[PDB]
Amino acid sequence: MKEFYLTVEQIGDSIFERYIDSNGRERTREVEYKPSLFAHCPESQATKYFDIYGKPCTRKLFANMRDASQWIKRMEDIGLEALGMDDFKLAYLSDTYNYEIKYDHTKIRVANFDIEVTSPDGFPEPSQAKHPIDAITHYDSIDDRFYVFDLLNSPYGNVEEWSIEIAAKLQEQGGDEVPSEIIDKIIYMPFDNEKELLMEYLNFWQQKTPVILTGWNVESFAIPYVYNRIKNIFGESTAKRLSPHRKTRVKVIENMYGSREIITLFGISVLDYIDLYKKFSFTNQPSYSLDYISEFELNVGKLKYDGPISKLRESNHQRYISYNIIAVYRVLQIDAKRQFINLSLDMGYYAKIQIQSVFSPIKTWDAIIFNSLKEQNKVIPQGRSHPVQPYPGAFVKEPIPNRYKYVMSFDLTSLYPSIIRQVNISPETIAGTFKVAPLHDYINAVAERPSDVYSCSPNGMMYYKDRDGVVPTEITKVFNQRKEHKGYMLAAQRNGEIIKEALHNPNLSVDEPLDVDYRFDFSDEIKEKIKKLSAKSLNEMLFRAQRTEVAGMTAQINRKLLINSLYGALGNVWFRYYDLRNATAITTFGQMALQWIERKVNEYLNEVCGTEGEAFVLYGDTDSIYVSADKIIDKVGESKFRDTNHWVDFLDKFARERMEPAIDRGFREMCEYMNNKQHLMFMDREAIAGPPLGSKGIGGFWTGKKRYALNVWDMEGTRYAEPKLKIMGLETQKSSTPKAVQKALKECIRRMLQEGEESLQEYFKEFEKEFRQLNYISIASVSSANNIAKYDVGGFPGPKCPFHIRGILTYNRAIKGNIDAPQVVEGEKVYVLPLREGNPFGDKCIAWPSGTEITDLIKDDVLHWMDYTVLLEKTFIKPLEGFTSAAKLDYEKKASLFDMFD
DNA sequence: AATGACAGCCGCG
DNA sequence: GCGGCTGTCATTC
């Protein structure tokens, strides 16, 4: 087996590495790594090393990392560049694994854990770990077992042991409904006292020290807690045992509102699933509780237990422990689906970095380029420090608020990475600059052509066309790799077809599968064995095919991720290859591109429609343009179409056959104009929207930049059975909006786009007529309560007190002096309802804990005093008018016309 | 980032 | 008594 690393750390002058060896054993070693760095040297001094600028460098080998560091400070002092990889861990890795890392995840220990802490006085702060750890469930990937540690006695109660039998039973039979798939993988361990528990858990941790440490919120609660808990009860000494190198640091991070500390365990890679999810799920969620996310992903969350959590251990210790077991399992299921732990490993080993550095694009790319240049005996630039200066972004067309019956959109392919390749932008391919004309000038092609020797950008930058830069080369390398593994896609999948096709008539014999790699499309030169196959073959020849075929999907998706994160690093001052001029070159060029094609499209459609100066592109944005098909559908007449699907195809054909060509023609012109190194500006029809043929629907509308809704029928070739609404930017998409209301608003938008004015008006009247019968929770708006105290002045609203926070105050006053009432905690979200003047709460509104019913101590009055009128007006009506006004509809009959003036 | 609820502040017999 | 702004607090893209 080819050896691969697990974790690497630098402690002093030595590197500590944990790795899987030739025989698959987990080993660990200390290495007095001797790093090498480079300095510029005179021409005479012949060497094999050169910097990305072609200048000669001499390799300086140091006695130990300390010296290398000190040397860099010195050089820095004097003012001379110190070249080479300053992050020795990365160099050590690159040196020790001078090849393509092939890792066997089966040998990598991935732990998934969660603990429980009974705390009667509020959230158990991890920085203090005041209360005992009541329970711990720790799942190990190597053993595929859940190890449970149950504390049977604590100052908060003495409970009985947990029953695996009771746990497996059904809810109705008084069970916990712990899945049968894990019911056998549970190892229970009850403890008489906490000290015995923590001590045995620490031992357990030494026998099975995690390589990858995950869980949910584990790095901001579980680890810090267990760390400080053991620290206080035994001493920082024994607490350090949590780290395989007994070295730990307390990192303190200051966020949006405050600050929180987290523990760094040298020798372990912490991949908190909440961060994993947040970074790779690519989806904004109203809440990140494991409960919400699990429900969303797995369609099921966590045991609906009764009573508060603080008293759940005492009241029902049975449930309490099972609740902890299933909490761990859930994350494991979510990962079983999303596969983020594996995606991380895959990306880490490809870039040869610490697996946790997956969260940093800067670090990921820095390594990817370092290793690439090192193979060519080139030396990376010294990371320079730059001033965070803002810079020009993308261009967003100000759209004319209105309805748009027919719309067709086109997107540019990976604009930024493409622009970097087309123009050939890189820190070392900068040729020079040139007199810059106003951007509009270049968009209309009236400004003087920049140059005829160098590739240019509308911002004034010129790049060499001869040599390919370091950056564009790496992205292309990645771009290619993508289509390389996606070439292995239909080479193990699409090919796994001669297997399911030959599976209908399996010859009767006892033969084994044709043991040969599938990655490559099988041929009749060896795979000729089609019928000779039996039943245990064909059926086995589509496991491997599909087993690896998917493995490709991991590479393709990961390549997409680096490709999309590259611009990220590039426009970031801490990046080794950042350059304000290049960052601007990229965005400015894009600015031009989108508005250039906008011009071209408008010119084309106007000519082919025989009109003059008609604006066909109604809205542009970064890399998308939306065209109004109205004029096109009219050149035929809606009457000439059989049904809806009829004009959809018409448009699809028109776009592909007439527009696509016009567009590419236009961009080639632009590439020549800027004398770019390569034409890579590609645009594809994306969506086709409009109303059902013969309906009174308006098809779509725009409120303003980034705010629209379209009734789409075909998306990039894929035609939907039922039209899907594409809504970007409106209330219907904000969690702050009451559920029942996002519902109604969605229905409103729908009836507007597909049914028409009269329909909307009908639904409006009905919704408003049954508003008062809706459940008080579904009609309340939700908000995040930050800095509650900030505006608290004796339980009353201070100056400039936000409406929802002022609501919190009225609630605090309403329950002040009754510990049995749910507390509104800082940072958390709260439900908010208005209250009709003269209410016993003394204020205009009242808020309470989100996701929960309001305490019955005030429930009956809040229900009697809530202001339905105001509630409706502010949450429902106001936003609706925002849509209808734009689309020129009325959601109510008899509305004067002179409203839309002044 | 830009679009939007609330807050108080100015302005005009 | 309530349009015109600028200053918070929020939310999603």
CSV table of C-alpha atoms in Angstrom, one decimal, chain A residues 161-502:
chain,number,residue,atom,x,y,z
A,161,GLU,CA,-29.1,2.5,34.1
A,162,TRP,CA,-30.1,2.9,30.5
A,163,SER,CA,-31.9,0.0,28.9
A,164,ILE,CA,-31.0,-1.0,25.4
A,165,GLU,CA,-34.2,-3.1,25.3
A,166,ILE,CA,-36.5,-0.3,26.3
A,167,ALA,CA,-34.6,2.0,23.9
A,168,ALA,CA,-35.2,-0.3,20.9
A,169,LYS,CA,-38.9,-0.5,21.5
A,170,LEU,CA,-41.6,1.7,19.8
A,171,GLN,CA,-42.8,5.0,21.1
A,172,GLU,CA,-46.2,3.6,21.8
A,173,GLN,CA,-44.8,0.8,23.9
A,174,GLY,CA,-42.9,3.5,25.9
A,175,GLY,CA,-39.7,3.0,23.9
A,176,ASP,CA,-37.1,5.4,22.5
A,177,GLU,CA,-37.3,4.1,18.9
A,178,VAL,CA,-33.5,3.9,18.6
A,179,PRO,CA,-33.0,2.4,15.0
A,180,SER,CA,-32.3,-1.2,14.6
A,181,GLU,CA,-29.2,-0.5,12.5
A,182,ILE,CA,-27.3,0.9,15.4
A,183,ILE,CA,-29.0,-1.0,18.2
A,184,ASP,CA,-26.3,-3.7,18.1
A,185,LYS,CA,-23.4,-1.2,17.7
A,186,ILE,CA,-24.0,0.3,21.2
A,187,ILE,CA,-21.6,-0.3,24.0
A,188,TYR,CA,-23.0,1.0,27.3
A,189,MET,CA,-20.8,2.1,30.2
A,190,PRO,CA,-22.5,3.5,33.4
A,191,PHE,CA,-20.4,5.2,36.0
A,192,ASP,CA,-20.9,5.7,39.7
A,193,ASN,CA,-19.3,9.2,39.7
A,194,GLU,CA,-18.2,11.8,37.2
A,195,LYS,CA,-14.5,11.5,38.0
A,196,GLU,CA,-14.6,7.8,37.1
A,197,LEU,CA,-16.4,8.7,33.9
A,198,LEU,CA,-14.0,11.4,32.7
A,199,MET,CA,-11.0,9.2,33.7
A,200,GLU,CA,-12.2,6.2,31.7
A,201,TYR,CA,-13.2,8.4,28.8
A,202,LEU,CA,-9.7,9.9,28.6
A,203,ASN,CA,-8.2,6.4,28.6
A,204,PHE,CA,-10.6,5.4,25.9
A,205,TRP,CA,-9.4,8.4,23.9
A,206,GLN,CA,-5.8,7.4,24.2
A,207,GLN,CA,-6.7,3.9,22.9
A,208,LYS,CA,-8.6,5.3,20.0
A,209,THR,CA,-7.3,8.8,19.5
A,210,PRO,CA,-9.3,10.5,16.7
A,211,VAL,CA,-7.7,11.5,13.5
A,212,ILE,CA,-10.8,13.4,12.3
A,213,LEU,CA,-12.9,14.8,15.1
A,214,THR,CA,-16.5,15.7,14.2
A,215,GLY,CA,-20.0,16.1,15.5
A,216,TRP,CA,-22.4,19.0,15.7
A,217,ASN,CA,-21.1,22.3,17.1
A,218,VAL,CA,-18.5,20.0,18.7
A,219,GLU,CA,-15.7,22.6,18.4
A,220,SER,CA,-17.6,25.4,20.1
A,221,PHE,CA,-19.2,23.4,22.9
A,222,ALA,CA,-18.3,19.7,23.2
A,223,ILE,CA,-14.6,20.0,23.0
A,224,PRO,CA,-14.2,23.2,25.0
A,225,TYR,CA,-16.4,21.8,27.7
A,226,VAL,CA,-14.8,18.4,28.1
A,227,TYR,CA,-11.4,20.1,27.9
A,228,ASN,CA,-12.1,22.6,30.7
A,229,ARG,CA,-14.1,20.1,32.7
A,230,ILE,CA,-11.3,17.7,32.9
A,231,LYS,CA,-8.9,20.7,33.4
A,232,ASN,CA,-10.7,21.9,36.4
A,233,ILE,CA,-11.3,18.5,38.0
A,234,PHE,CA,-7.8,17.2,37.3
A,235,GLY,CA,-5.6,19.9,36.1
A,236,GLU,CA,-4.4,21.3,32.8
A,237,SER,CA,-1.8,18.5,32.8
A,238,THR,CA,-4.3,15.6,32.4
A,239,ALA,CA,-6.6,17.7,30.2
A,240,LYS,CA,-3.8,18.0,27.7
A,241,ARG,CA,-4.0,14.3,27.2
A,242,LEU,CA,-6.8,15.0,24.9
A,243,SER,CA,-4.1,15.9,22.4
A,244,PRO,CA,-1.9,13.0,21.2
A,245,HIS,CA,1.1,15.3,21.5
A,246,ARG,CA,-0.1,16.7,24.8
A,247,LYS,CA,0.1,20.2,23.4
A,248,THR,CA,-3.0,22.5,23.2
A,249,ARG,CA,-3.7,26.2,22.7
A,250,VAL,CA,-6.7,28.3,23.6
A,251,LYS,CA,-7.8,30.2,20.5
A,252,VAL,CA,-10.2,33.1,21.1
A,253,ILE,CA,-12.5,34.3,18.3
A,254,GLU,CA,-14.5,37.6,18.3
A,255,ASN,CA,-17.7,37.3,16.2
A,256,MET,CA,-20.6,39.5,15.0
A,257,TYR,CA,-21.7,40.4,18.5
A,258,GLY,CA,-19.1,39.1,20.9
A,259,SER,CA,-16.3,36.5,21.4
A,260,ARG,CA,-15.8,32.8,22.3
A,261,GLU,CA,-12.8,30.6,23.0
A,262,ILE,CA,-12.1,27.2,21.4
A,263,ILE,CA,-9.5,24.5,22.1
A,264,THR,CA,-6.8,23.5,19.7
A,265,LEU,CA,-5.8,19.9,20.0
A,266,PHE,CA,-2.4,19.4,18.3
A,267,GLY,CA,-2.5,16.1,16.5
A,268,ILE,CA,-6.1,16.2,15.6
A,269,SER,CA,-8.1,17.6,12.7
A,270,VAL,CA,-11.4,19.0,13.9
A,271,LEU,CA,-14.1,19.2,11.2
A,272,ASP,CA,-17.2,20.4,13.1
A,273,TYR,CA,-20.1,19.2,10.9
A,274,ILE,CA,-22.0,22.4,11.4
A,275,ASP,CA,-19.1,24.2,9.6
A,276,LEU,CA,-18.8,21.4,7.1
A,277,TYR,CA,-22.5,21.7,6.3
A,278,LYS,CA,-22.4,25.5,6.3
A,279,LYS,CA,-19.5,25.5,3.8
A,280,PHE,CA,-20.5,22.7,1.4
A,281,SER,CA,-24.3,22.4,1.6
A,282,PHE,CA,-24.7,25.6,-0.4
A,283,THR,CA,-28.1,26.5,1.0
A,284,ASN,CA,-29.2,29.1,3.5
A,285,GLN,CA,-31.3,27.6,6.3
A,286,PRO,CA,-33.4,29.5,8.8
A,287,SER,CA,-31.8,27.5,11.7
A,288,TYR,CA,-28.7,25.3,12.1
A,289,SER,CA,-29.9,23.2,15.0
A,290,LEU,CA,-29.1,19.5,14.4
A,291,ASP,CA,-32.8,19.1,14.8
A,292,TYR,CA,-33.8,21.4,12.0
A,293,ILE,CA,-31.1,20.3,9.6
A,294,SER,CA,-31.7,16.6,10.3
A,295,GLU,CA,-35.3,17.1,9.6
A,296,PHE,CA,-34.5,18.9,6.4
A,297,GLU,CA,-32.0,16.3,5.2
A,298,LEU,CA,-33.2,13.1,6.7
A,299,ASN,CA,-37.0,13.8,7.1
A,300,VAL,CA,-36.9,13.1,10.9
A,301,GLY,CA,-35.1,14.9,13.7
A,302,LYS,CA,-34.8,14.1,17.4
A,303,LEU,CA,-37.1,12.4,20.0
A,304,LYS,CA,-40.0,14.7,21.0
A,305,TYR,CA,-39.4,14.6,24.7
A,306,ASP,CA,-41.6,16.3,27.3
A,307,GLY,CA,-40.6,19.0,29.7
A,308,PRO,CA,-37.5,21.2,29.7
A,309,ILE,CA,-34.1,19.7,29.0
A,310,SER,CA,-32.6,20.7,32.4
A,311,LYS,CA,-35.0,18.3,34.1
A,312,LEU,CA,-35.1,15.6,31.4
A,313,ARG,CA,-32.3,13.7,32.9
A,314,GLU,CA,-34.1,13.3,36.2
A,315,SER,CA,-37.7,12.9,35.0
A,316,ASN,CA,-36.8,10.5,32.2
A,317,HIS,CA,-33.2,9.4,32.2
A,318,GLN,CA,-34.1,6.6,29.8
A,319,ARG,CA,-35.0,9.0,27.0
A,320,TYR,CA,-32.2,11.3,27.9
A,321,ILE,CA,-29.5,8.8,27.0
A,322,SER,CA,-31.2,7.6,23.9
A,323,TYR,CA,-31.6,11.2,22.9
A,324,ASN,CA,-27.9,11.5,23.1
A,325,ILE,CA,-27.3,8.4,21.1
A,326,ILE,CA,-29.6,9.4,18.2
A,327,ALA,CA,-28.1,12.9,18.2
A,328,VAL,CA,-24.8,11.4,17.2
A,329,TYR,CA,-26.4,9.0,14.7
A,330,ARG,CA,-28.2,11.9,13.0
A,331,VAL,CA,-25.0,13.7,12.0
A,332,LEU,CA,-23.7,10.3,10.8
A,333,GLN,CA,-26.8,10.0,8.6
A,334,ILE,CA,-26.6,13.4,7.3
A,335,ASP,CA,-23.0,12.6,6.3
A,336,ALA,CA,-24.0,9.2,5.0
A,337,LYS,CA,-26.0,11.3,2.6
A,338,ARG,CA,-24.0,14.5,1.9
A,339,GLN,CA,-20.6,12.8,2.2
A,340,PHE,CA,-18.8,16.0,3.5
A,341,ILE,CA,-16.3,14.2,5.7
A,342,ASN,CA,-15.1,12.4,2.7
A,343,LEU,CA,-15.1,15.4,0.4
A,344,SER,CA,-12.8,17.1,2.9
A,345,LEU,CA,-10.3,14.2,2.9
A,346,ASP,CA,-10.4,14.1,-0.8
A,347,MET,CA,-9.7,17.8,-1.1
A,348,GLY,CA,-7.0,17.8,1.6
A,349,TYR,CA,-4.9,15.1,0.2
A,350,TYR,CA,-5.1,16.5,-3.3
A,351,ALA,CA,-3.7,19.8,-2.1
A,352,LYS,CA,-1.4,18.1,0.5
A,353,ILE,CA,-2.5,20.2,3.4
A,354,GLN,CA,-3.9,19.6,6.9
A,355,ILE,CA,-7.4,18.3,6.4
A,356,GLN,CA,-8.9,21.1,8.4
A,357,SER,CA,-7.4,23.7,6.1
A,358,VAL,CA,-10.1,22.7,3.7
A,359,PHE,CA,-12.0,25.6,5.1
A,360,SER,CA,-9.5,28.0,3.8
A,361,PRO,CA,-9.3,28.7,0.0
A,362,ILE,CA,-6.1,30.7,0.5
A,363,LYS,CA,-4.4,27.8,2.2
A,364,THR,CA,-5.8,25.2,-0.2
A,365,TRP,CA,-4.7,27.0,-3.4
A,366,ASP,CA,-1.4,28.2,-1.9
A,367,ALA,CA,-0.5,24.5,-1.5
A,368,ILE,CA,-1.8,23.5,-4.8
A,369,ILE,CA,0.3,26.0,-6.6
A,370,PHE,CA,3.4,25.5,-4.3
A,371,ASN,CA,3.5,21.8,-5.1
A,372,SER,CA,3.0,22.4,-8.8
A,373,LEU,CA,5.8,25.0,-9.1
A,374,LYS,CA,8.1,22.8,-6.9
A,375,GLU,CA,7.8,20.0,-9.4
A,376,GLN,CA,9.2,22.4,-12.0
A,377,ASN,CA,12.0,23.5,-9.6
A,378,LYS,CA,10.4,27.0,-9.5
A,379,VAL,CA,10.1,29.0,-6.3
A,380,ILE,CA,7.0,30.8,-4.9
A,381,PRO,CA,7.0,34.5,-4.1
A,382,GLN,CA,7.4,35.7,-0.6
A,383,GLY,CA,3.9,36.3,0.8
A,384,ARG,CA,3.7,40.1,0.8
A,385,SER,CA,1.5,42.2,3.0
A,386,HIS,CA,-1.0,44.5,1.3
A,387,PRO,CA,-3.6,47.1,2.4
A,388,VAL,CA,-7.2,45.9,2.3
A,389,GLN,CA,-8.5,48.3,-0.4
A,390,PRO,CA,-12.0,47.9,-1.7
A,391,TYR,CA,-12.4,47.2,-5.4
A,392,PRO,CA,-14.9,47.3,-8.3
A,393,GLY,CA,-17.3,44.3,-8.3
A,394,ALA,CA,-19.9,43.0,-10.8
A,395,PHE,CA,-22.4,45.0,-12.8
A,396,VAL,CA,-26.1,44.9,-12.0
A,397,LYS,CA,-28.5,46.4,-14.5
A,398,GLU,CA,-31.2,48.6,-12.9
A,399,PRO,CA,-34.4,46.8,-14.2
A,400,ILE,CA,-37.6,48.7,-14.9
A,401,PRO,CA,-40.1,47.4,-12.3
A,402,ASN,CA,-42.7,45.7,-14.3
A,403,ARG,CA,-44.4,42.5,-15.5
A,404,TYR,CA,-42.7,40.5,-18.2
A,405,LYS,CA,-44.8,37.9,-20.1
A,406,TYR,CA,-42.1,36.1,-21.9
A,407,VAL,CA,-38.5,35.9,-20.7
A,408,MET,CA,-35.5,33.9,-21.7
A,409,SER,CA,-32.2,33.9,-19.7
A,410,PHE,CA,-28.6,33.1,-20.6
A,411,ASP,CA,-25.6,32.6,-18.3
A,412,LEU,CA,-21.8,32.9,-18.9
A,413,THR,CA,-19.8,29.8,-18.1
A,414,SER,CA,-17.6,30.2,-15.0
A,415,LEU,CA,-17.1,33.9,-15.9
A,416,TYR,CA,-14.2,34.8,-13.6
A,417,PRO,CA,-12.1,31.7,-13.9
A,418,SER,CA,-12.7,31.9,-17.7
A,419,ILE,CA,-11.7,35.6,-17.8
A,420,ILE,CA,-8.5,34.7,-16.0
A,421,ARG,CA,-7.8,32.2,-18.6
A,422,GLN,CA,-8.9,34.3,-21.6
A,423,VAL,CA,-6.9,37.4,-20.6
A,424,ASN,CA,-4.2,35.3,-19.0
A,425,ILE,CA,-4.1,37.3,-15.7
A,426,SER,CA,-1.4,36.3,-13.3
A,427,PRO,CA,1.0,38.1,-10.9
A,428,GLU,CA,3.9,37.4,-13.4
A,429,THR,CA,2.3,37.8,-16.8
A,430,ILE,CA,1.8,41.6,-16.3
A,431,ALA,CA,3.3,43.2,-19.4
A,432,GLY,CA,2.3,46.8,-18.7
A,433,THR,CA,-0.5,49.3,-18.9
A,434,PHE,CA,-2.3,51.6,-21.3
A,435,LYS,CA,-4.2,54.9,-21.6
A,436,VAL,CA,-7.7,53.9,-20.3
A,437,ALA,CA,-10.9,55.1,-21.9
A,438,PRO,CA,-14.2,55.2,-20.1
A,439,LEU,CA,-15.7,51.7,-19.7
A,440,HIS,CA,-18.8,52.7,-21.8
A,441,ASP,CA,-16.4,53.5,-24.7
A,442,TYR,CA,-15.1,49.9,-24.7
A,443,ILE,CA,-18.5,48.5,-24.3
A,444,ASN,CA,-19.7,50.2,-27.5
A,445,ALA,CA,-16.3,49.5,-29.1
A,446,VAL,CA,-15.6,53.1,-29.9
A,447,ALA,CA,-12.5,53.5,-27.8
A,448,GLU,CA,-9.1,52.9,-29.4
A,449,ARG,CA,-8.0,49.2,-29.3
A,450,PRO,CA,-5.8,48.9,-26.2
A,451,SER,CA,-2.9,47.0,-27.9
A,452,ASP,CA,-2.0,44.5,-30.6
A,453,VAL,CA,0.7,42.8,-28.7
A,454,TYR,CA,-0.6,42.1,-25.2
A,455,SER,CA,-3.9,40.6,-23.9
A,456,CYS,CA,-5.9,43.5,-22.2
A,457,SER,CA,-8.5,44.4,-19.7
A,458,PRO,CA,-10.7,47.5,-19.7
A,459,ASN,CA,-9.1,48.6,-16.5
A,460,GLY,CA,-5.7,49.3,-18.1
A,461,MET,CA,-3.8,46.1,-17.6
A,462,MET,CA,-1.8,44.3,-20.3
A,463,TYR,CA,-0.7,40.7,-20.1
A,464,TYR,CA,1.8,38.6,-22.1
A,465,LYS,CA,0.2,36.3,-24.7
A,466,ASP,CA,3.3,34.1,-25.3
A,467,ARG,CA,3.9,32.4,-22.0
A,468,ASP,CA,1.0,31.0,-19.9
A,469,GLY,CA,0.9,32.4,-16.4
A,470,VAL,CA,1.1,30.5,-13.2
A,471,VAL,CA,-2.5,31.2,-12.2
A,472,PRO,CA,-4.3,30.5,-15.5
A,473,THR,CA,-2.2,27.3,-15.8
A,474,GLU,CA,-3.4,25.9,-12.5
A,475,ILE,CA,-7.0,26.6,-13.0
A,476,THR,CA,-6.9,25.1,-16.5
A,477,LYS,CA,-5.1,22.1,-15.0
A,478,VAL,CA,-8.1,21.9,-12.6
A,479,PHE,CA,-10.6,22.6,-15.4
A,480,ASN,CA,-9.2,19.8,-17.4
A,481,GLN,CA,-8.9,17.4,-14.5
A,482,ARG,CA,-12.7,18.0,-14.1
A,483,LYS,CA,-13.5,16.9,-17.6
A,484,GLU,CA,-11.0,14.1,-17.1
A,485,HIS,CA,-12.8,12.4,-14.2
A,486,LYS,CA,-16.2,13.2,-15.8
A,487,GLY,CA,-14.7,11.3,-18.7
A,488,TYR,CA,-14.4,8.4,-16.3
A,489,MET,CA,-18.1,9.1,-15.5
A,490,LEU,CA,-19.7,7.5,-18.5
A,491,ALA,CA,-16.6,5.2,-18.6
A,492,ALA,CA,-17.9,3.3,-15.6
A,493,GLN,CA,-21.6,4.3,-15.6
A,494,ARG,CA,-22.7,4.6,-19.2
A,495,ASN,CA,-20.4,1.5,-19.7
A,496,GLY,CA,-22.1,-0.3,-16.9
A,497,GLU,CA,-24.8,-0.7,-19.5
A,498,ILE,CA,-23.4,-3.5,-21.6
A,499,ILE,CA,-23.6,-5.2,-18.1
A,500,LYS,CA,-27.3,-4.6,-17.4
A,501,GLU,CA,-28.1,-5.3,-21.1
A,502,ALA,CA,-26.3,-8.7,-21.0
